[PDB]
């Protein structure tokens, strides 16, 4: 509903098709936070 | 002023060291005595605290009716009454060095007044005035049930009532010593120490004074079978309530005032501190008619008690004095106990909600709460 770019489109397409299911995905604000923290000289990353 | 019972029931005394005086009544020589009203069914309905040196009209187990005075005492005056009956002799009692002579202008009934170390001369600084109870033969009368001789010391600002050579009995006063809301809940949950904390005892045994006015006063506790050389630093500017002639327990106060939850946790355990916190929070919430179950306060207290401090390394990798998670210590100890080894020993720590929430294992949550720069 807020900030998953692919999830919004997939949910809208599924709703128009009568399939009430979602693929959650990853919020974009978390990626923005990761980039901002990396810009401070700190190595933060997701693993596995 | 005095305890006024409301209903009819039996009287019970808890932690009572009382003796019969000359007049036939009962006087309490124990600080932590509690008076309870238990009916025939066995359920307590009324509870009260009896101060040191109070006269009880009735005894333990006697039947009393409502609207009756069961105990009486002088609030402003602290009695220093004795237990044995005999003549009083003044030992280490010198005028002009430890005491003074002041005569009442109007009443005319007065005697020597014991001075304090902050006013008396230096020569009397090392001298402890005392009153000794003897018999007609001059020998020291040993207190029944004990072996040490019966002598009582006198602190400063003590007004001696009876002069030397006057016969006294049990219960007679030797000297007189003159004396909420949302922020409350916030302070309770943050475990903030009060401005004037209550001074407690760390170890049991007999108690005694030490070097006087060495910056601040000192206290010494000699256990019966413990570590004698233990000592404590206590300022003398606060009204003290310790009895140098009486044995004190670690669950006893020295001065008076609000008690810090950290001291309660350290000296009495987890149950005492959680009960104190729950009772205080419920007392605050009950005056407004709010009904809240105790489960929530209990889980909050549990979340506050999430840290432990190692007291010896033992077989584990934990160092001497690092603060760690309680659950990790429990897991390590239960793992080592199955290997035949010996686990480490720990002491629980109390943290405020703000401080406990900043010490979690996850740094994402801590950075989300507050103080992002330091946590990161």
């Amino acid at each position: 509903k807020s900030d998953d770019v692919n999830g919004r489109t997939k949910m809208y397409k599924n709703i128009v098709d009568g399939n009430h299911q979602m693929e959650p995905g990853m919020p974009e604000s978390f990626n923005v936070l990761l980039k901002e923290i990396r810009s401070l000289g700190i190595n933060i990353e997701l693993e596995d | 002023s005095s305890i006024q019972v409301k209903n009819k029931g039996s009287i019970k005394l808890s932690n009572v060291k009382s003796v019969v005086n000359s007049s036939g009544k009962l006087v309490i020589t124990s600080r932590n005595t509690e008076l309870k009203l238990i009916d025939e069914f066995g359920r307590t309905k009324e509870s009260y605290k009896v101060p040191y040196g109070a006269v009880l009209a009735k005894g333990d187990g006697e039947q009393v009716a409502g609207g009756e005075t069961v105990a009486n005492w002088d609030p402003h005056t602290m009695p220093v009454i004795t237990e044995v009956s005999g003549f009083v002799r003044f030992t280490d009692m010198i005028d002009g060095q430890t005491i003074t002579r002041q005569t009442d202008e109007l009443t005319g009934l007065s005697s020597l007044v014991v001075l304090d170390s902050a006013e008396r001369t230096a020569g009397g600084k090392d001298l402890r005035p005392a009153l000794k109870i003897v018999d007609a033969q001059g020998n020291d009368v040993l207190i029944p049930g004990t072996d040490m001789p019966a002598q009582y010391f006198l602190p400063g600002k003590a007004i001696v009532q009876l002069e030397d050579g006057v016969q006294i009995s049990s219960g007679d006063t030797l000297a007189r010593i003159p004396q909420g809301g949302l922020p409350r809940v916030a302070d309770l949950f943050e475990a903030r120490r009060p401005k004037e904390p209550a001074i407690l005892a760390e170890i049991s045994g007999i108690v005694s004074f030490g070097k006087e006015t060495k910056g601040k006063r000192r206290l010494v506790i000699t256990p019966v079978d413990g570590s004698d050389p233990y000592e404590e630093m206590i300022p003398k500017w606060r009204q003290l309530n310790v009895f140098e002639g009486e044995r004190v327990e670690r669950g006893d106060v020295i001065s008076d005032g609000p008690e810090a939850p950290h001291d309660i946790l350290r000296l009495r355990g987890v149950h005492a501190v959680t009960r104190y916190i729950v009772n205080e929070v419920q007392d605050v919430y009950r005056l407004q008619g709010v009904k809240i179950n105790d489960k929530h306060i209990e889980v909050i207290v549990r979340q506050m008690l999430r840290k432990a401090t190692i007291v010896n390394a033992g077989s584990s990798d934990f160092l001497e004095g690092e603060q760690v998670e309680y659950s990790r210590v429990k897991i390590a100890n239960r793992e080592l106990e199955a290997n035949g080894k010996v686990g480490a020993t720990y002491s629980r720590d109390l943290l405020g909600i703000t401080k406990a929430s900043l010490a979690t294992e996850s740094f994402i949550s801590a950075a989300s709460f507050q103080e992002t720069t330091r946590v990161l």
Partner: protein
């Protein structure tokens, strides 16, 4: 319609597992070609699934058994 779900909760035993089971059945009836086991009365798949659960016709074990039977039948008829 539906105003309460207490009977379905009593049948399943847990409110959190009831949601998952009902969602599974409703997705079977909606995306898939399954037909309801109760006479539908202008109801949606969620309410139909809840009514089926209340009657005792649908639970997690029944769904697992039906899925295993369908998979076995498909694998047998593939040849």
């Amino acid at each position: 319609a539906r105003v309460t779900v207490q009977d379905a909760v009593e049948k399943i035993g847990n409110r959190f597992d009831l949601v998952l089971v009902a969602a599974r059945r409703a997705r079977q009836m909606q995306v898939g070609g399954k037909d309801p086991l109760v006479p539908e009365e202008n109801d949606k798949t969620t309410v139909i699934a809840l009514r089926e659960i209340e009657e005792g016709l649908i639970n997690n074990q029944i769904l697992d058994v039906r899925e295993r039977q369908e998979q076995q039948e498909q694998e047998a008829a593939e040849l």
